[PDB]
Structures are given as structure tokens and as C-alpha cells.
């Protein structure tokens, strides 16, 4: 599994987006395009996240 750490807050704009806060750890579910990935948060919510706002987390 791949997890990322949010570097910035993301409020979301489109219905499909997953909003998150700086420091949130998100699971990556799939990578449909280079800069937008499908992720899930600890509350079970799913949606698209901007790849430039996150960092690999180990």
C-alpha cells in the first residue's frame, strides 16, 4: 500500500475532490492521471487529491 502526507490544506473545488488538512495521512487507491490521484482518508471518505500537495510517507 502507498500512503502520502499532506503538505498543505486542500479545501476541494469539484464534487469529486477529497478535502484534507496539512499533515493528514491519506491512502492512495489508484492513479488515473499524473497529478490527480484517488485517495481515502481515515474516516473512509474517498476522492481525488492534487499530487503536488502531498509527499511520500513511510
Amino acid at each position: 500500500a502507498e500512503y502520502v502526507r499532506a503538505l498543505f490544506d486542500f479545501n476541494g473545488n469539484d464534487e469529486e475532490d477529497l478535502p484534507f488538512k496539512k499533515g493528514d495521512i491519506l491512502r492512495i487507491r489508484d492513479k488515473p492521471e499524473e497529478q490527480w490521484w484517488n485517495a481515502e482518508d481515515s474516516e473512509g471518505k474517498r476522492g481525488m487529491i492534487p499530487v503536488p500537495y502531498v509527499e511520500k510517507y513511510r
Binding site: 498543505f8 492513479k31 492521471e33 499524473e34 490527480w36 481525488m48 492534487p50 503536488p52 500537495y53
Partner: peptide
Amino acid sequence: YGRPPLPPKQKRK
């Protein structure tokens, strides 16, 4: 590093 611009959404796989 600052904060990078929000990326455009493109055609998906």
C-alpha cells in the same frame, strides 16, 4: 518551496 499551483485536471486512464 512555497506552495505549488493547483494542477489542471486532464484525461484519465
